[PDB]
């Protein structure tokens, strides 16, 4: 159950985003990566550009 | 943790002894013995392990080239060996010495080529030398020259070299039976030396290029499969899987490939 | 973008002299861009 | 046959299974195990183990210590290779180059100076960073290597070198292009196998410290709470304990108590 908290605490780190945008495809198979990670120092800033250059890999019509 | 394809739990203990023991086993030329690459089979026919075992091919030449990369000892150790007897012996013999020749042409013809020396006729001429302080006249038997009790054995050695350049022995030059003295025991050492140092190079580029070719090759093979799809775990896995290689890439790509294991397992339909 | 410094010694027929301790110094502008013009609305975002 | 006082078969097993495997698992040290001292204890509560557990404590730091001192790895074969990269590289390149042979070698002598190391690490950075570029900038790189992909491999290894002193590894080196063409060994080799060899030691003299201070620690309670009774069998028991004890008398120590067990436990109330 700790886990699902994390995985929420991260999306909203991230961006604030909406649990509707939580259901997207390229978020439902990132933020349990996202999970084993944040929990270190490393950044909240990355984590914004990670999902903006992932959301564009996936939407190449 | 140790990443393979669907495969099964005693091929995995097969694959992990063969790459962890890599060292120990005589001829270690993936392609020469088939036990291994026709072993790392999913099963099923053809339908049911085509796209799999040419991912789990793919992570075999991956990691043989990591661990070969990851286990190659020191060559250059021998080479200064190698600058040691060329530079302090034969030289010191040629101009305080006396009787030889001049500065320009001996001096320089052991100083050039330092670095990718591929050169036979340097050997030669110093099998000439040699060859001239000892007994006989011509070029027959030129390695250890006045004396064939060890050409077997030392072309054995050069043989397992070629075979296993991983763990390699340097023979020797025996002490109390000689042609002739301190001089013709350094000739001796430095060429077999250099024939060993020639030897180990291009047999591990041999391997490396052939290793490089394999990758490179079922890459292209990979991609032609899995372009087809549009989902995005698909296409998530076309570009991990499409991430160009170098050698020097592929220790970094084995770590990514890692993490990525858990997506691209789902990828595969 | 980041600036790199280069220190290089000379080729070996000017290292010779007296000047095998020389190191040229070249500041390389790694991953930023020539510029021209100035730049008005991103100039929170851009340095010169 | 390892006799324990007064413990439960699953806790016997417990506390031999932990001997039998100190040498596998990582962290070996007793006070980092807390289910090993509260597996030390008791039956019936604390009446029982305000004098049992305190004898049963002080069988087993004694077999700990034992363990330790009988499962000590040579570390001489890693100072040797150390000597022979130092010797054989780092002093006749510094008489090859002309830089007039500084011995800081010479001056460490012996594995007797763990001390001295660091400043030598040092001169070896600005030995490596020298033979790398000709700048000489003094930089600030832990390892002379510059090769940043494994030195947190190499962190890795030095914690768990730490943590198991008793079972360790050694990490070799990568050859694609070298920086430093033999001297990769004893410029980068030689400070992490110099490392590697001062921390082992620093580790085991601490524990062996630890060790013989809570055996010291367990002798000063037991026998004071063993003061009491003046009974024949009670003051041969007070004899017995009330011995002081160093590192090197611990396994006679043991080979006394394994006789005496016997009467002891009839001893204690």
Known sequence: ?61 | SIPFAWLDRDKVQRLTNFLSNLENLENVDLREHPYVTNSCVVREGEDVDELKTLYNTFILWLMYHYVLSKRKPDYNAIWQDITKLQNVVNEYLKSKGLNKGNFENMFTNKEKFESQFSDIHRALLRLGNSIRWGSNVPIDTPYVNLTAEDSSEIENNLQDAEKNMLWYTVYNINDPWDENGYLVTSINKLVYLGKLFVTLNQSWSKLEKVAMSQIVTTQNHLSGHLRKNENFNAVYSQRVLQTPLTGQRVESFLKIITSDYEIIKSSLE | TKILEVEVSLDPAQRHGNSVHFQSLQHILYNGLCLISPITTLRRYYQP
């Open chain 1, 1 to 61: 159950k700790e886990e699902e908290k994390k995985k929420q605490q991260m999306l909203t780190g991230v961006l604030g985003l909406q649990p509707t945008m939580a259901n997207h495809p390229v978020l439902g198979v990132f933020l349990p990566k996202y999970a084993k990670q944040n929990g270190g120092n490393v950044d909240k800033t990355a984590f914004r550009l990670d999902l903006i250059r992932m959301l564009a890999l996936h939407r190449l019509n």
